[PDB]
Design a protein around this ligand. Structure first.
Ligand SMILES: O=c1ccn([C@@H]2O[C@H](COP(=O)(O)O)[C@@H](O)[C@H]2O)c(=O)[nH]1
Lengths: 245, 250, 238, 239, 240, 244
């Protein structure tokens, strides 16, 4: 292994320069399964990787685990091995009334409600997605006839307080986030997630390309259906990947 | 007038919903000259406005002045008048060695080195351009043929210390901005300009679409300053691109 | 031109060392009109400038435009040409119920609700006016005879949310400024304007003298004058 | 399940009120194996929980994963199931020259170089350990003779720049963290790790007890079983 | 005097390495009179220093005055003279309804609502007490058998606004602290005081052991000093 | 006592509306002596207070103690007691090479290197002094003809690291202040003291007038610790005289 965590060597990537990055390790194989010559690479902690092929071009799929701390390790080490483009796929929950379940969200930039993001660039720096990646995702989404929403996402370091959830053990939410969800809505933020601030800030400030697409599987404001939503989101990302080789 | 600063009424707009917002009032007439039937609407303080037609549709060209404070006023009042899409065209100085004078810059998002953006959203929110507006600018640049770069921009509230210039009266740069240019370069920031941060943040956080394109008229890393003033035809280059891009957003 | 924005040469100042810097370029001639040998020098962007003579000494009148960014440029370039004293004259909205429209206000220091001021000094540093400049202004107010108030001013980067105005396109105000006026009010802040924090901060931390006067055009709870005063104050600092 | 992430029910805990929480799921079983009647409970992502007995009382051993965000989901949800005491066991490096491999570290509180911690308390709130938990750890580390160092730890959201590492793809370290390690060293910080700040801040601000022990396995400026022994021994006296 | 503010020299300490630091100069003597050989060393501004002898070892009691600023002068000039262990004894008011008057509070760490701590470490650094010191104070309160609460303390730079008091000349509290007391209570904060944040932070980041004990003399939601004073003199014996 | 810390009653001010407030409690007496009918009121902790008469009007001299936390208490309780104008007299370390020991520095506004001022207004609010008070202090010094410097002051919550003193136990200063003195120096800041920030802030933000003057006892461009004061105090009194 040439990296301290992933358990991969550059040879395992076979000249790959693009990686699709889901959060959950179990979604790796299912993503790879849609490309050619898919094979397992490695699995260590939340990091399970696979390599496939798209138009004879090596492509890799690697899980990033939950959160920016995890994601920063995966991005950094893949970068070291040779990846230059990162496409994040994942399912999310919307905080906007006009964004319905089954909708597809492509993130232009993210609200930095995380911590790892500051380890790469000051807060004034925008956790913005790469343009090519974003156009690849936006175009792959329409080619499938998906109902898309291209905009701002709020990326939190917590699943609960940071997303203003009160159905918790303490029932309290620190001042900073009190009444925060309604403000994000008023500001047009589409959803909440937990890795895009880091992913987007890391890459945008270190010469790497990154983008993110997600399927909406539940809308806060208001089984097998979610099934198809992830199947289409994954479809969207693999097709966007083809354009970015 | 229906707005306190611009001296404009919705009637003046004739249904327009897109505005091209340069920073110099003197440049408004020139942008409008790339379109059909341009008419001067008004001029008060920093805000000079003209109306033109693009593919038979009403379009507004209005100067914002230097800085986000002045820019926030123009944008705000224009939005009250109906405008929903803002395309900013400007000149800039690149901070990257590979970005040559005469090239065109499209901005995906900006480093918020200003204060007005904070009047619309906390620093955590991204000063990102609208997707459609950026798409139009990138596509139009292709139609025109310019050498284009797409990425991050540093929007500074000052023209001197914020862009780490030392050729000043005091000759000093406050701690925060000491060695900051080298940091932005390292982070891949393309250039410095003074209105995008505010523009992008206030539009993205208020359901308005905004774009930003500029012509590099000088390089902070290069020694020789832009070939006379005719080399500053880059201004005319970026201008055509911003106008072509508006076409696709009508 | 010796500066990139103003379009003025050091000789155009004719040895001037003070400047009245109003916000609106269309008001620059009026002010120069109150002194002697008033001559238009140039007009580029939001910076229109005239030179004049007061007490036999050269004086510059230069518009800054709206906001600290535009002001920071005018002040820097004018300082590059030799100006060492800057007297700002503007309009403003009083936020104290006892301050009436038509009254004049002299700022001692401002609340830094801007950003350009951060390009000259950390937020701990005070955006305070120069003593001799404040005094001249207070003095001139007495001579010209006007309802004057001397105190703290809130300097905002925006005219709408930063001054907590709601009749806007979004009609909303970001958390930071939600209920911020009542607060400034309870802290005895007199008014809302948009250039002092930058003007005052950048001069105070760079060995330049600055003063700030303004005529009230509206009370958030209800020119010839403040101009006469700034001209009068200017003669007291030549 | 009663919780959305760990796949558990209050019933599964058997009344347990204390949990040993390592990072790596793989280490979960080895830890429960040192107790009584260890049984697998669940495994979803990096959250694999086991339930054992220590002197007649049920205790849960649950992995958190890497980082505070991951840690924040397990603590919260474990606390919803009834967990009121948390004990983090781990291995770590060290930025002090007087700490050698095999040494044991007991954190009294930590520097907050994370972000999840700020979702529970303002940065001015101390990411302090619970006194009883810290006592139980020191007494336990003393019972086996492990040379212990009790002090402050630097908890970082990143493994690379946050720990001022330049051996990276960019070989760059943002201004905030440039020259920071030496700073932490001068201030006596013992080591770097990535979940303590989140764990300590969210417990100390929500009526939950927390402690953390770690064995030194590497020294930048220059044992796993011991650590584990010490956390179980300590958990023993806090039931 | 080879120490600018305290007017004390290295010999005035007689080898002392531990110091008890109350905030009131009038409390110094009283504390010092609990041990052998009580001697007055000096008294300048808010700083009145006395020397005592505990179990044959020299001990110092030096007032800090009110606030982190004056406390940082005392701690620094005493450390320059050779002090490494600092024990602050104080009187305080709990903000938790389950804490009664006459109770003893031991501080593990402090919410940094002061400004002098930032002069020793960035806000992220924890205003945490020293383990030894803390254990000693805890054991002493037990040996004395007094009610003891061990936890977090909110250390404020002001006595009124920062502790959210409205019965003042202006009657207004700045946004930052508007509603702040409720927050602290829900977070488990035991009380308010005005020196621990600076003390604890400037000690933990410079290699100096520090502990903090205090007796409850008032409760916002509604023998003590002796108990507090005895515990700290007892605690010092263990840290000797 | 009407207040919790000063041990005074509204009656003890005898109608006083102005209070000269020094830092050292052992200096309140030297200041009261310079006036008519001085009388000692109380001495609790760091707050020793005296009363005097200036031009037939009562005046209070009350020590504030070191730092804004101690000062805020003094100002707050004295204000509660009826004081409305505060003239602070202190000592200070000049950071400019041209300022001489004994020179009198009148402060127009201070850099908030404290923390208590944040308890009254956000950092964006200026720690500025009252125009009348500053005017009186400036003129009174002129009346005497003492070397005077009017300008900005740097007010911190510490005497050592905050004013960038390296000659200490650790010999280091946190990043926040490394190379800070040179900054303030380049920005024209005249000196370092420790209470004006909180004072000027809490007063300017609560409708209380406040002035600030100090005597130079060391020049930081030459040394960290030292080895005319009468002038500074003569000024704060003459100044007070014009504010009654
Ligand atoms: O309810 C309380 C308890 C304590 N303190 C502060 O904590 C100090 C602790 O007492 P001492 O040691 O300074 O006398 C008090 O003087 C005071 O500054 C308060 O402000 N409020």
């Amino acid at each position: 292994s040439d990296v301290f965590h992933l358990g991969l060597t550059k040879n395992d990537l076979q000249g790959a320069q693009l990686a699709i990055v889901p959060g959950d390790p179990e979604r790796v194989e299912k993503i790879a399964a849609l490309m050619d010559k898919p094979v397992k690479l490695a699995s260590h902690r939340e990091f399970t990787s696979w390599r496939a092929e798209l138009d004879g071009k090596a492509v890799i799929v690697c899980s990033t685990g939950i959160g920016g701390p995890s994601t920063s390790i995966a991005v950094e080490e893949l970068a070291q091995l040779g990846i230059r483009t990162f496409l994040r796929i994942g399912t999310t929950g919307a905080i906007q009334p006009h964004i319905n379940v089954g909708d597809v969200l492509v993130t232009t930039a993210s609200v930095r409600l995380d911590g790892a993001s500051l380890h790469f660039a000051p807060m004034e720096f925008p956790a913005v997605a790469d343009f090519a990646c974003t156009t690849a995702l936006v175009e792959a989404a329409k080619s499938i006839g998906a109902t898309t929403h291209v905009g701002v996402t709020a990326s939190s370091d917590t699943f609960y307080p940071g997303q203003e959830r009160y159905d918790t053990y303490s029932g309290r939410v620190v001042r900073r986030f009190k009444g925060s969800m309604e403000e994000w809505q008023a500001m047009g933020v589409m959803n909440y997630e937990m890795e895009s601030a880091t992913l987007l800030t890391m890459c945008a400030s270190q010469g790497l390309r990154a983008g993110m697409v997600a399927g909406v599987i539940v809308n806060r404001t208001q089984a097998e259906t979610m099934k198809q939503t992830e199947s289409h989101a994954v479809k969207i990302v693999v097709e966007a990947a083809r354009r970015l080789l």
